[PDB]
Structure 1
Amino acid sequence: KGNFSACTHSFGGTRDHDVVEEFIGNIETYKDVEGISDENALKGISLLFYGMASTWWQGVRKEATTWKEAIALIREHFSPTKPAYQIYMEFFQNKQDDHDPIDTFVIQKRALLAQLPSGRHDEETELDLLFGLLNIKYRKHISRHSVHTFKDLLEQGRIIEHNN
């Protein structure tokens, strides 16, 4: 049942990294689960676009010979893969305001530090870079030489949050 006919996943070019990555991951997981022979997914790729994207496909259809080239064309035309220094400046911009728990902040900061080139930064320097931008209410009790991985920091922050 790999006719790519019944799928409720869509995309319309909203120009943001998260929506594009969600769409690409959902398509590739669907192809891995239901079963496509890696050629029928090119003949039925036009059943998922709407609005501004369908005009783009009817424009640039004649430069797609495989599947990986089409997925690379989507990722290159709708995400310009931002350089190094703007990510660091955006990262140090925001502080952790009150009425915001640890889980949302740690999820957003770990989603931001994945657009750097891979293999440059291990876990310890990443946690040391994260630890400065936390509020005083947690930081009075969770001082260093006590955590080594993000799971322990999330656990102790959750205990200090739900305790009082």
Structure 2
Amino acid sequence: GKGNFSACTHSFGGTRDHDVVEEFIGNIETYKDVEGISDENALKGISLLFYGMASTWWQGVRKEATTWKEAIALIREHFSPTKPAYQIYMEFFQNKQDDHDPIDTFVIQKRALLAQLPSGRHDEETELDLLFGLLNIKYRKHISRHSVHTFKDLLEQGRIIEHNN
């Protein structure tokens, strides 16, 4: 029911992205859940993980924290900004697919970029209608817009059109 973080292999040096902060916070959560450390006994030991710029940052803001929840909220708030609405739409229409790229990677990326909008703002139909207008000419000359509905079918038609070529 007690112990330090000194045994861990994870450390967060501070970089402004999403995947790194998410993976680090998840690993720290699994470690604290697995070794049984309690909530108020855990906050005192948190300093050992940071290094470089993160150590100076934690030395800065420290009296505003009081429990574990506030610490996670502060890290997430200062090291991964929430992008506003319009930048996502601007990023979405500035990158048409190239001749050398399978349908799967393109659809997966363009779908992963669309979930950051506030929930419930879009329907499957309107989103799929938005997705066209960027597919390269090799696929648009066969499948027609009024012969598809959900995302399960577009991948099917794309695979059959790919294997024939």
Aligned residue for 1:121?
Answer: 122
Unaligned runs of at least 5 residues, structure 1 = none
Aligned residue for 1:148?
Answer: 149
CA distance in 1, matches of 2:147, 2:3: 51
| Percent of residue pairs identical | 100
CA distance in 1, matches of 2:35, 2:149: 40
Q: TM-score, normalised by structure 1?
A: 0.81
Question: 1:33: Cα distance to partner?
Answer: 5.5
CA distance in 2, matches of 1:134, 1:10: 41
CA deviation map 1:112-152 (0-9, x unaligned): 21221222113222222112211111222332344333333
CA distance in 1, matches of 2:4, 2:147: 53
CA distance in 1, matches of 2:157, 2:31: 37
1:32 and 1:158, CA in 2 relative to 1: closer, same or farther beyond 3 A? Answer: farther
- Does structure 2 conserve the Cα–Cα contact (< 8 Å) formed by 1:17 and 1:79? yes
Unaligned runs of at least 5 residues, structure 2 = none
CA distance in 2, matches of 1:40, 1:141: 63
1:94 and 1:41, CA in 2 relative to 1: closer, same or farther beyond 3 A? Answer: farther
Aligned residue for 1:57?
Answer: 58
Q: TM-score, normalised by structure 2?
A: 0.80
- Does structure 2 conserve the Cα–Cα contact (< 8 Å) formed by 1:12 and 1:52? yes
Q: Which moved more, 1:19-28 or 1:120-129?
A: 19-28
CA distance in 1, matches of 2:125, 2:40: 44
- Aligned residue pairs total 164
- Does structure 2 conserve the Cα–Cα contact (< 8 Å) formed by 1:3 and 1:40? no
- Based on CA coordinates, which of the two structures has the bigger radius of gyration? 2
CA distance in 2, matches of 1:5, 1:43: 12
Question: 1:95: Cα distance to partner?
Answer: 0.6
Q: Which moved more, 1:1-10 or 1:52-61?
A: 1-10
CA distance in 1, matches of 2:89, 2:97: 16
CA deviation map 1:55-111 (0-9, x unaligned): 111111222112221121112112221211111011111111121222222222222
Question: 1:54: Cα distance to partner?
Answer: 1.1
Q: Which moved more, 1:4-13 or 1:133-142?
A: 4-13
Q: Give me the CA root mean square deviation.
A: 2.6
Query: Alignment partner of 2:63: what SS?
Result: helix
Question: 1:41: Cα distance to partner?
Answer: 3.9
Q: Which moved more, 1:4-13 or 1:103-112?
A: 4-13
1:147 and 1:34, CA in 2 relative to 1: closer, same or farther beyond 3 A? Answer: farther
CA distance in 1, matches of 2:35, 2:147: 46
Aligned residue for 2:107?
Answer: 106
CA distance in 2, matches of 1:146, 1:34: 54
